[PDB]
Amino acid sequence: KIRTSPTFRRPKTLRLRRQPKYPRKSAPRRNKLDHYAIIKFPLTTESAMKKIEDNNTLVFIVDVKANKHQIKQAVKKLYDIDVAKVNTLIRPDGEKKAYVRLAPDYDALDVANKIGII
Amino acid sequence: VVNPLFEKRPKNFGIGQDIQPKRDLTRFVKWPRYIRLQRQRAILYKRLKVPPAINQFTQVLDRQTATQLLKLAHKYRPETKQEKKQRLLARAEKKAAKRPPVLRAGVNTVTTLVENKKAQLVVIAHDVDPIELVVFLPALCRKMGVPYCILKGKARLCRLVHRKTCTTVAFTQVNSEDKGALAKLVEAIRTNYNDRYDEIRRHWGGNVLGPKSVARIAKLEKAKAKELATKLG
RNA sequence: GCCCUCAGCCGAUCGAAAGGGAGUCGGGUUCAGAUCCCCGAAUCCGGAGUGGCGGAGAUGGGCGCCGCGAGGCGUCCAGUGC
RNA sequence: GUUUUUUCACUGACCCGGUGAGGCGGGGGGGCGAGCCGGGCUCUCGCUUCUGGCGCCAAGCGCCCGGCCGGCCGGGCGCGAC
């Protein structure tokens, strides 16, 4: 072995990982934000129902921490219905307004009549 | 016989002809500060002037006498720490149903029995880091008449007994079976270390510079010796 | 997971909605929204375990013959282009 | 042996320059040439000057071992920049 580089390089000495005896916290955090709480309510406005009858969409009021895929999974777990795409805005009053596009096999007026609202 | 398709290709290593290979650059590699300091610390003993109180450490006992002293000290080694607990358990069983002479250690035990005049031989390390512990002891053992030797390795001196390090070792009591072999070592150490302490006090040392400086001085010295041989004549 | 072997850079990071800065046009649609909703045509990037298929790679040249000739046997090679 | 001043020169204190802290000092070896008598003294030298490309991951000699059935396959260590 000969000293090749004139710069003294520090070799890969040692590092380890956590092998504890007991963890830090006792009770871990569970899923606080539930699927019933992540979807608050739909908007029953006359122009909104006209938009639902026209373009076959749905207008939901969603919590701001949710994502566009999380709205799709939260609707698919509860109501068992497919979602084409999700388009969300945020109102100036401080609420998220989603636009869930449905597939034409399940009608939006029919799924509204199933849950009861009109 | 051989295949003529293979061709010898001599790459002549020259400036502007071929690239140069690597080399052992142990002086050219930038060493770290602590390595450079601990390497120049041994150089500082050669460069600077050495007083005789430090120069007396340079006298080292030779290999045959050192191995003979280690073989003599191997006979009177203390027992194991587990054997101490086994001997205490045997004493407890003897109670339910006089120490042998050993070798001492540590300067606070040794130096008191030096003036109490119980030891016969002293073993000192040569490169101990608390250097202030040693200095007064050879000068005092010269006046007391106790032989002292300077051996190699405080670690191997301490690992004889069930310890790690040891500063000084005193040979307090031996039996009659190991008397003449100890007395020959006492006579050898007394003729080696003790009987020329008046030359140890007057023997100055150090002032040995680098070999580049020695060669640069000796080149001019040989040049002057050559010029004086044919200058006037 | 260990032992060999190799690697440069001017030093973490911040710093432009007038700097560099991939990937959509028209039509209609509401009392208030349009490159955002709808229709009809499009384009770029990422992944893919058996990549699901088409195509180069890829299919030729020389010898012994059989065979009227086609065509196929054994023996030598060419191939990561015109 | 002790004390005052002058001359010098170190280096191991102190000040400054650069680097990726890359070829520092001696002994010894080789081509060519010099004076003295095929021997010895020291000096000399140590690969690139014809045109806007370039030489980056050694060849070559030796010393040994493993596997397969004297022959094939795969490796290690030196001289090679005294």
From Swiss-Prot, chain A:
Disulfide bonds: none annotated. It is found in: Cytoplasm; Nucleus. Residues 1-29 have a biased composition (Basic residues). It comes from the Eukaryota. N-terminus is methylated by METTL11A/NTM1. GO terms for biological process: translation. Keywords: Acetylation, Citrullination, Cytoplasm, Isopeptide bond, Methylation, Nucleus, Phosphoprotein, Ribonucleoprotein, Ribosomal protein, RNA-binding, rRNA-binding, Ubl conjugation. The modification Citrulline is found at R3. GO terms for molecular function: rRNA binding; structural constituent of ribosome. One of its GO terms (cellular component) is ribosomal subunit. Signal peptide: none annotated. Component of the large ribosomal subunit. Interacts with LYAR and GNL2. Interacts with MDM2; this interaction may promote MDM2-mediated p53/TP53 polyubiquitination. Directly interacts (via BIB domain) with IPO5, IPO7, KPNB1 and TNPO1; these interactions are involved in RPL23A nuclear import for the assembly of ribosomal subunits. Interacts with IPO8. Component of the large ribosomal subunit. The ribosome is a large ribonucleoprotein complex responsible for the synthesis of proteins in the cell. Binds a specific region on the 26S rRNA. May promote p53/TP53 degradation possibly through the stimulation of MDM2-mediated TP53 polyubiquitination. The N-terminal beta-like import receptor binding (BIB) domain mediates interaction with IPO5, IPO7, KPNB1 and TNPO1. Belongs to the universal ribosomal protein uL23 family. This is Large ribosomal subunit protein uL23. It comes from Oryctolagus cuniculus.
UniProtKB/Swiss-Prot annotation, chain B:
Keywords: Acetylation, Cytoplasm, Isopeptide bond, Ribonucleoprotein, Ribosomal protein, Ubl conjugation. This is Large ribosomal subunit protein eL8. Belongs to the eukaryotic ribosomal protein eL8 family. Component of the large ribosomal subunit. Interacts with CRY1. Interacts with DICER1, AGO2, TARBP2, MOV10 and EIF6; they form a large RNA-induced silencing complex (RISC). The modification N6-acetyllysine is found at K8, K71, K184. It comes from the Eukaryota. It comes from Oryctolagus cuniculus. The chain holds residues 80 to 319 of 319 of the full protein. Transmembrane segments: none annotated. Signal peptide: none annotated.
